[PDB]
């Protein structure tokens, strides 16, 4: 079902899995990047993420924000990034739950249009539906061809450890938040991983019995892929800060957080959302899906590509949104189908669920303090990190109690960035709250 492709950064462009791609925010600019199709619809561009930054932002005040302007600055570094992403995707598909996540992402193709598109119309000529591919075959006229895609993963922006998933907005509307879905993008760094100490076993523990852990970058990635899934199905939660008025037992921090993060994390985090707000979220998805089902009952033409088969795409979307059709061919929402799909998209894949299923230690809440990141020594070394078990390798006795992620135990696996990073961590681990 899901095949992870193999390639080396210096392999030649083949206009198939290795292409020159103009990413969505560069639509029409002619800025192309060497891009690698790691699986159907998913691309890796092993370049720093630069859109909306300035070049000086990448140079040189906060131990929780790590900068390195030289990350990815050679072809070999770009190759290391590609091989690491391949390994992480193989780890994701090594269990059924992450395989299912990838299948849902691949099959969750953006609708062919957005709110600007007439109801009767399929428009592929927009940045949230296609990216341009440059074709430069020797002895031929150079040309560009728009292709479909679902996700493009870049390397990091200025701060290596600030991974983020990004949707496309136009004139204050995001197709990824309005039922249609849209090409999703990510800035991701596998080696500079988060650290956390908001875990149940520290609750009531004496200071010197507290444990702190570093994250498995496959879980970091799968957390981001849940945001991707929401944005491909058009249900990323729009403009909804959730403001705690009390510190629950699983919370370490109490800052306001977007609801999109709380559902993506799972565990206990949605429990602080009011029933009223939770119901508004459900009603919005339903209203937006009703818009899509009405579009499918009207669509007659693809205005941007006379090779698109309308009936093939109508049925792809019928399946994506789990619509039903009557004897006459009219589509509609079936409430039972809708609730099942909604529950899978919003509650079926969470950071907490995935961590438990992969036996990866995670934080007890998205409401967790920022701690300094650490650098993994070498994710490509199977003595440190494997597809099957991540850091928590049985044959090293690192599976027990997630010892392979415990900063006080698996010191072979990671490096502190500086003495100041370590000192800050030690303060956080030793501190008494009254």
């Amino acid at each position, epitope marked *: 079902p899901v095949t992870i492709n193999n390639f080396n950064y210096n392999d030649p462009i083949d206009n198939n899995n290795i292409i020159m791609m103009e990413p969505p*925010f560069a639509r029409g600019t002619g800025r192309y990047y060497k891009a690698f199709k790691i699986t159907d619809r998913i691309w890796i561009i092993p370049e720093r993420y630069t*859109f*909306g*930054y*300035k070049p000086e*932002d990448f140079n040189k005040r*906060d131990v929780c*924000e790590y900068y390195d302007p030289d990350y990815l600055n050679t072809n070999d570094k770009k190759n290391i990034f590609l091989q690491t992403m391949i390994k992480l995707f193989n780890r994701i598909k090594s269990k059924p739950l992450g395989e299912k996540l990838l299948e849902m992402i691949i099959n969750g193709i953006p609708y062919l249009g957005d709110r600007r598109v007439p109801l009767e119309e399929f428009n592929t000529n927009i940045a949230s539906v296609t990216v341009n591919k440059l074709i430069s075959n020797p002895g031929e006229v150079e040309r560009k061809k728009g292709i479909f895609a679902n996700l493009i993963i870049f390397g990091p*922006g*200025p*701060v290596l450890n*600030e991974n983020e998933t*990004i949707d496309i*907005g136009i004139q*204050n*509307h995001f197709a990824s938040r309005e039922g249609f879905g849209g090409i999703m993008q990510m800035k991701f760094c596998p080696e500079y991983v988060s650290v956390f100490n908001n875990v149940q076993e520290n609750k009531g523990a004496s200071i010197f019995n507290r444990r702190g852990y570093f994250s498995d970058p496959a879980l970091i990635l799968m957390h981001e892929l849940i945001h991707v899934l929401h944005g491909l199905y058009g249900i990323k939660v*729009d*403009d909804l*800060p959730i*403001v*705690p*008025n*009390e*510190k629950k037992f699983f919370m370490q921090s*109490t*800052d*306001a*957080i*977007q609801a*999109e993060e709380l559902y993506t994390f799972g565990g206990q985090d949605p429990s602080i959302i009011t029933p009223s707000t939770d119901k508004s979220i459900y009603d919005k998805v339903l209203q937006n899906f009703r818009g899509i089902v009405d579009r499918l009952n009207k669509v007659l033409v693809c205005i941007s590509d006379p090779n698109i088969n309308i009936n093939i795409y109508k049925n792809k979307f019928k399946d994506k949104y789990k619509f039903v059709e009557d004897s006459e061919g009219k589509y509609s929402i079936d409430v039972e189908s809708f609730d099942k799909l909604y529950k899978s998209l919003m509650f079926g894949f969470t950071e907490t669920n995935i961590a438990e299923n992969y036996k990866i230690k995670t934080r007890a809440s998205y409401f967790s303090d920022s701690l300094p990141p650490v650098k993994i020594k070498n994710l490509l070394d199977n003595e440190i990190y494997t597809i099957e078990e991540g850091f928590n390798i049985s044959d090293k006795d690192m599976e027990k109690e997630y010892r392979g992620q415990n900063k006080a135990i698996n010191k072979q696996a990671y490096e502190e960035i500086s003495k100041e990073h370590l000192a800050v961590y030690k303060i956080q681990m030793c501190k008494s709250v009254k």
Partner: nanobody
Amino acid sequence: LGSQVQLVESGGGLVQTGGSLRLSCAASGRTFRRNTMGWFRQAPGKVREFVAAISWSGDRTYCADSVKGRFTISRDNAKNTVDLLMNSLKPEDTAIYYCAADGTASVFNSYASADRNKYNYWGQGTQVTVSS
């Protein structure tokens, strides 16, 4: 507690077409001296629309095309304020204006700064009405 943070917008009112207002937002409950701040506006029946944003140092501002040249955002970190000077107001500018803070201290990005989801603290808004 997130509920102890307050952004208070002020300076809204009624003006005639062509007039000017200066909105101001005072933050309390924590500092935002290393944080991007922005102004948004919401008209009846519409989404919260980006107006303008400003980096923590003021060295990087961004604003919507429809207000460029007429609206200026500025900030005074010592006084915990962010201001929006609105000149050449038109009826289309009528809306509730909101000031918003990105409570995570991260590098200003002009694209991210236009996204309401990148802000976790919001004021209750100040009404601006422009009549002909």
